[PDB]
Short mmCIF file of C-alpha atoms and ligand atoms in Angstrom, two decimals:
data_model
loop_
_atom_site.label_atom_id
_atom_site.label_comp_id
_atom_site.label_asym_id
_atom_site.label_seq_id
_atom_site.Cartn_x
_atom_site.Cartn_y
_atom_site.Cartn_z
CA UNK A 2 0.28 -0.37 0.26
CA UNK A 3 1.24 3.48 -0.43
CA UNK A 4 0.13 6.29 1.11
CA UNK A 5 -1.52 9.91 -0.46
CA UNK A 6 -2.34 13.49 1.23
CA UNK A 7 -4.95 15.58 -0.29
CA UNK A 8 -3.80 19.75 0.20
CA UNK A 9 -7.08 21.43 1.04
CA UNK A 10 -9.65 20.28 3.25
CA UNK A 11 -13.04 18.56 1.09
CA UNK A 12 -16.63 16.35 2.59
CA UNK A 13 -16.13 12.49 2.09
CA UNK A 14 -18.24 13.06 -1.16
CA UNK A 15 -15.49 14.41 -2.61
CA UNK A 16 -12.89 12.91 -0.79
CA UNK A 17 -13.87 9.46 -2.63
CA UNK A 18 -14.17 11.28 -5.42
CA UNK A 19 -10.80 12.22 -5.83
CA UNK A 20 -9.44 9.08 -4.12
CA UNK A 21 -11.40 7.07 -6.76
CA UNK A 22 -10.35 9.38 -9.59
CA UNK A 23 -7.06 7.66 -9.49
CA UNK A 24 -8.23 3.92 -9.00
CA UNK A 25 -7.47 4.46 -5.36
CA UNK A 26 -9.78 4.93 -2.24
CA UNK A 27 -9.72 6.71 1.49
CA UNK A 28 -6.75 4.96 3.59
CA UNK A 29 -8.27 2.32 6.35
CA UNK A 30 -5.48 1.46 8.35
CA UNK A 31 -5.29 -2.17 8.66
CA UNK A 32 -2.63 -2.17 11.78
CA UNK A 33 -0.21 0.38 13.90
CA UNK A 34 2.11 0.35 11.60
CA UNK A 35 -0.31 1.42 8.53
CA UNK A 36 -2.17 4.03 11.18
CA UNK A 37 1.82 5.43 11.12
CA UNK A 38 2.31 6.36 7.76
CA UNK A 39 -1.39 7.59 7.25
CA UNK A 40 -0.47 10.12 10.15
CA UNK A 41 2.96 11.03 8.76
CA UNK A 42 2.04 12.16 4.97
CA UNK A 43 -1.18 13.93 6.45
CA UNK A 44 -0.33 17.21 7.63
CA UNK A 45 -3.84 17.77 9.94
CA UNK A 46 -7.82 16.07 10.55
CA UNK A 47 -8.01 13.24 7.71
CA UNK A 48 -10.28 11.27 6.59
CA UNK A 49 -10.59 7.78 6.33
CA UNK A 50 -12.58 5.05 4.95
CA UNK A 51 -14.00 4.26 7.54
CA UNK A 52 -17.70 3.84 8.49
CA UNK A 53 -20.82 3.93 11.34
CA UNK A 54 -23.43 4.63 8.19
CA UNK A 55 -25.21 1.37 7.13
CA UNK A 56 -25.77 0.38 10.19
CA UNK A 57 -24.34 2.62 13.64
CA UNK A 58 -21.84 1.64 16.32
CA UNK A 59 -21.41 -0.94 13.42
CA UNK A 60 -18.04 0.77 11.87
CA UNK A 61 -17.00 -0.81 8.38
CA UNK A 62 -14.31 0.20 5.78
CA UNK A 63 -15.81 1.81 2.56
CA UNK A 64 -16.55 -2.06 0.76
CA UNK A 65 -18.06 -2.93 3.71
CA UNK A 66 -15.85 -4.81 5.77
CA UNK A 67 -16.08 -5.03 9.15
CA UNK A 68 -12.33 -3.03 10.56
CA UNK A 69 -10.87 -4.69 13.04
CA UNK A 70 -7.96 -2.76 13.85
CA UNK A 71 -9.42 0.54 15.12
CA UNK A 72 -7.22 2.91 17.42
CA UNK A 73 -10.37 5.43 18.59
CA UNK A 74 -9.50 8.33 21.12
CA UNK A 75 -10.27 8.25 24.49
CA UNK A 76 -14.37 8.72 24.53
CA UNK A 77 -14.80 8.05 20.53
CA UNK A 78 -17.27 6.75 18.98
CA UNK A 79 -19.41 9.00 20.37
CA UNK A 80 -21.83 10.05 17.60
CA UNK A 81 -22.92 13.91 18.90
CA UNK A 82 -24.22 16.48 17.72
CA UNK A 83 -27.12 14.33 14.96
CA UNK A 84 -24.72 12.22 14.68
CA UNK A 85 -21.52 11.33 13.30
CA UNK A 86 -21.02 8.62 10.30
CA UNK A 87 -17.54 8.78 9.50
CA UNK A 88 -14.31 8.79 10.98
CA UNK A 89 -10.93 10.41 10.97
CA UNK A 90 -7.57 10.81 12.37
CA UNK A 91 -6.56 13.25 14.45
CA UNK A 92 -2.74 15.16 14.51
CA UNK A 93 -1.67 12.25 17.49
CA UNK A 94 -2.78 9.40 15.66
CA UNK A 95 -5.73 8.55 17.37
CA UNK A 96 -9.26 8.65 15.58
CA UNK A 97 -12.91 10.49 16.52
CA UNK A 98 -16.15 9.75 14.62
CA UNK A 99 -17.08 13.13 12.64
CA UNK A 100 -19.78 14.34 11.08
CA UNK A 101 -19.96 13.09 6.54
CA UNK A 102 -20.82 16.44 6.37
CA UNK A 103 -17.61 18.11 7.71
CA UNK A 104 -14.73 18.87 5.29
CA UNK A 105 -10.95 17.62 6.44
CA UNK A 106 -7.43 16.75 4.12
CA UNK A 107 -8.01 13.47 2.63
CA UNK A 108 -5.60 10.13 2.66
CA UNK A 109 -6.03 8.13 -0.68
CA UNK A 110 -4.70 4.90 -0.29
CA UNK A 111 -2.87 2.70 -3.19
CA UNK A 112 -1.77 -0.61 -4.19
CA UNK B 1 10.96 4.47 -6.65
CA UNK B 2 8.64 6.39 -8.41
CA UNK B 3 4.47 5.16 -8.62
CA UNK B 4 2.16 6.30 -11.31
CA UNK B 5 -1.50 6.14 -11.27
CA UNK B 6 -4.22 6.68 -14.50
CA UNK B 7 -7.15 8.61 -13.65
CA UNK B 8 -10.12 7.73 -14.81
CA UNK B 9 -11.87 10.84 -16.84
CA UNK B 10 -10.27 12.53 -19.23
CA UNK B 11 -8.94 15.65 -19.08
CA UNK B 12 -6.79 18.43 -20.69
CA UNK B 13 -3.66 19.74 -18.77
CA UNK B 14 -4.50 22.71 -16.60
CA UNK B 15 -7.22 20.19 -14.89
CA UNK B 16 -4.45 17.16 -15.34
CA UNK B 17 -1.55 18.94 -13.06
CA UNK B 18 -4.27 20.46 -10.72
CA UNK B 19 -5.55 16.48 -9.64
CA UNK B 20 -1.76 14.58 -9.57
CA UNK B 21 -0.84 17.71 -7.72
CA UNK B 22 -4.41 17.13 -4.96
CA UNK B 23 -2.46 14.64 -4.04
CA UNK B 24 1.11 16.29 -4.14
CA UNK B 25 2.18 14.49 -7.17
CA UNK B 26 2.74 15.61 -10.80
CA UNK B 27 2.33 14.62 -13.67
CA UNK B 28 3.69 11.28 -15.41
CA UNK B 29 7.34 12.42 -17.03
CA UNK B 30 9.49 9.06 -18.36
CA UNK B 31 13.12 9.64 -18.10
CA UNK B 32 14.00 6.03 -19.58
CA UNK B 33 11.79 3.46 -21.29
CA UNK B 34 11.28 1.14 -18.10
CA UNK B 35 9.23 4.29 -16.72
CA UNK B 36 8.03 4.40 -20.72
CA UNK B 37 6.47 0.78 -19.94
CA UNK B 38 5.44 1.30 -16.59
CA UNK B 39 2.88 4.44 -17.17
CA UNK B 40 1.99 2.27 -20.87
CA UNK B 41 1.30 -0.26 -17.70
CA UNK B 42 -1.27 1.79 -16.39
CA UNK B 43 -2.66 4.06 -18.77
CA UNK B 44 -5.19 1.91 -20.77
CA UNK B 45 -6.00 4.92 -23.42
CA UNK B 46 -4.19 8.13 -24.95
CA UNK B 47 -3.07 10.10 -21.85
CA UNK B 48 -0.85 13.31 -21.13
CA UNK B 49 2.42 13.10 -19.47
CA UNK B 50 3.95 16.04 -17.81
CA UNK B 51 6.34 17.46 -21.07
CA UNK B 52 5.67 20.45 -23.64
CA UNK B 53 7.45 22.84 -25.72
CA UNK B 54 6.03 25.93 -24.38
CA UNK B 55 8.30 28.30 -23.40
CA UNK B 56 10.23 27.91 -27.07
CA UNK B 57 8.87 25.77 -30.04
CA UNK B 58 10.54 22.71 -29.99
CA UNK B 59 11.98 22.58 -27.29
CA UNK B 60 10.83 20.00 -24.81
CA UNK B 61 10.85 20.63 -21.31
CA UNK B 62 9.01 18.50 -18.78
CA UNK B 63 6.22 20.99 -15.83
CA UNK B 64 9.34 22.43 -13.64
CA UNK B 65 10.97 23.32 -17.08
CA UNK B 66 13.71 21.21 -17.02
CA UNK B 67 14.57 20.18 -20.21
CA UNK B 68 14.16 15.87 -21.33
CA UNK B 69 16.38 14.08 -22.33
CA UNK B 70 14.70 10.58 -23.57
CA UNK B 71 11.91 10.92 -25.50
CA UNK B 72 10.27 8.49 -27.60
CA UNK B 73 7.78 9.50 -30.23
CA UNK B 74 5.84 8.03 -32.63
CA UNK B 75 6.88 8.33 -36.72
CA UNK B 76 5.62 11.64 -37.79
CA UNK B 77 5.39 13.49 -34.13
CA UNK B 78 6.06 15.87 -32.65
CA UNK B 79 4.40 18.35 -35.51
CA UNK B 80 2.65 20.48 -33.81
CA UNK B 81 -0.39 20.74 -36.06
CA UNK B 82 -2.86 23.29 -36.70
CA UNK B 83 -2.44 26.21 -33.69
CA UNK B 84 -0.46 24.36 -32.39
CA UNK B 85 0.51 21.15 -30.34
CA UNK B 86 2.69 21.85 -27.40
CA UNK B 87 1.67 19.38 -24.99
CA UNK B 88 2.78 15.28 -25.26
CA UNK B 89 0.55 12.00 -24.90
CA UNK B 90 1.56 8.97 -24.45
CA UNK B 91 0.09 6.70 -27.44
CA UNK B 92 -1.18 3.40 -26.87
CA UNK B 93 1.44 2.02 -28.07
CA UNK B 94 3.59 3.09 -25.61
CA UNK B 95 4.95 6.01 -28.48
CA UNK B 96 4.54 10.06 -27.80
CA UNK B 97 2.94 12.06 -29.75
CA UNK B 98 2.42 15.79 -29.40
CA UNK B 99 -1.25 17.49 -29.47
CA UNK B 100 -3.65 21.09 -27.93
CA UNK B 101 -2.92 21.65 -24.80
CA UNK B 102 -6.76 22.34 -24.19
CA UNK B 103 -7.61 19.05 -25.17
CA UNK B 104 -9.12 16.49 -23.39
CA UNK B 105 -7.44 12.45 -22.31
CA UNK B 106 -6.34 10.60 -19.17
CA UNK B 107 -3.65 11.71 -16.90
CA UNK B 108 -0.83 9.87 -15.94
CA UNK B 109 0.33 11.56 -11.97
CA UNK B 110 3.76 10.30 -10.58
CA UNK B 111 4.50 10.18 -7.41
CA UNK B 112 7.67 9.06 -5.14
C1 MMA C 201 -21.31 8.18 4.77
O1 MMA C 201 -21.75 7.70 3.94
C2 MMA C 201 -21.37 7.78 2.33
O2 MMA C 201 -20.83 6.75 2.20
C3 MMA C 201 -20.94 5.44 2.92
C4 MMA C 201 -19.25 4.74 2.59
O3 MMA C 201 -19.37 4.59 1.49
C5 MMA C 201 -22.34 4.71 1.66
O4 MMA C 201 -22.34 3.61 2.42
C6 MMA C 201 -23.07 6.13 1.90
O5 MMA C 201 -23.79 5.80 0.78
C7 MMA C 201 -23.23 7.40 1.59
O6 MMA C 201 -22.55 6.55 -0.32
O1 MMA C 202 -17.62 18.41 19.68
C1 MMA C 202 -16.11 17.61 19.04
O2 MMA C 202 -15.20 16.58 19.55
C2 MMA C 202 -16.23 15.68 20.48
C3 MMA C 202 -14.91 15.11 21.73
O3 MMA C 202 -14.60 16.36 22.39
C4 MMA C 202 -15.82 14.92 19.15
O4 MMA C 202 -16.44 13.66 20.19
C5 MMA C 202 -17.10 15.26 17.76
O5 MMA C 202 -16.62 14.67 16.78
C6 MMA C 202 -16.39 17.31 17.57
O6 MMA C 202 -15.10 16.14 17.18
C1 MMA C 203 -4.10 15.44 -38.08
O1 MMA C 203 -3.79 15.48 -35.98
C2 MMA C 203 -3.66 14.67 -35.54
O2 MMA C 203 -3.07 13.13 -36.30
C3 MMA C 203 -1.77 13.46 -35.80
C4 MMA C 203 -1.32 12.59 -36.98
O3 MMA C 203 -1.15 12.06 -38.05
C5 MMA C 203 -1.19 14.75 -34.78
O4 MMA C 203 0.46 14.67 -35.16
C6 MMA C 203 -1.54 15.34 -34.37
O5 MMA C 203 -0.99 15.52 -32.59
C7 MMA C 203 -3.30 15.26 -34.59
O6 MMA C 203 -3.33 13.80 -33.16
CA1 CA C 204 -22.05 6.97 13.64
CA1 CA C 205 -17.06 11.89 18.06
CA1 CA C 206 4.95 22.94 -30.40
CA1 CA C 207 1.02 15.92 -33.32
CL1 CL C 208 -22.37 11.41 9.53
#
């Protein structure tokens, strides 16, 4: 896997479109090593290819596969506000669930 | 090492540049036959390369204004037809053709 970060912020739909344009997908860390690599390429908070849109509190990657490795920040995921179904990697490498409509950088993953 | 990725949609040069730079890459510029073939492997159809003679006609430079050495022009190219052809594309046989920068083609981005 190769990981690349965008320079501009955008919501999830636009983030998925960007990675897909170059035939990749929004980055999904499968272990601590990949999590660190994605954190490093990202200069600020960035979207990961994980959501619980299909079923609340059931986090899966963009292909529908349930995720095993997770690295939630303390108190997360909390689905606050009117709901948070997308996931971002914080600048400390931990994860926070956020609204898919909000804008963040995007880290794309390619094989 | 360099990694090459191809776009799905066709777009003119300005948009090709914008796409690759969005992910901090550049439009693919083969520096030898190995790279040219690596770009061929990912490009399913005619695709833009990061080379132009926009500064001085017939003097081909990469997008950073650095004169290129390796070239793989198709027979008869570059020919600068019509109102001018200052951009370069990789044909499906791996040879190059100069084309209008405003015309749309797939884009291959380069990262390292
Ligand atoms: C956040 O919701 C969007 O993204 C998820 C994950 O790709 C899809 O399941 C859903 O249909 C929407 O397109
Ligand atoms: O509210 C904001 O902060 C809390 C943690 O305090 C997060 O859970 C939430 O997604 C927002 O980022
Ligand atoms: C007629 O113009 C087209 O074909 C010639 C080759 O025949 C190319 O040089 C040119 O860039 C165009 O693709
Ligand atoms: Ca949720
Ligand atoms: Ca949250
Ligand atoms: Ca020309
Ligand atoms: Ca030509
Ligand atoms: Cl949401």
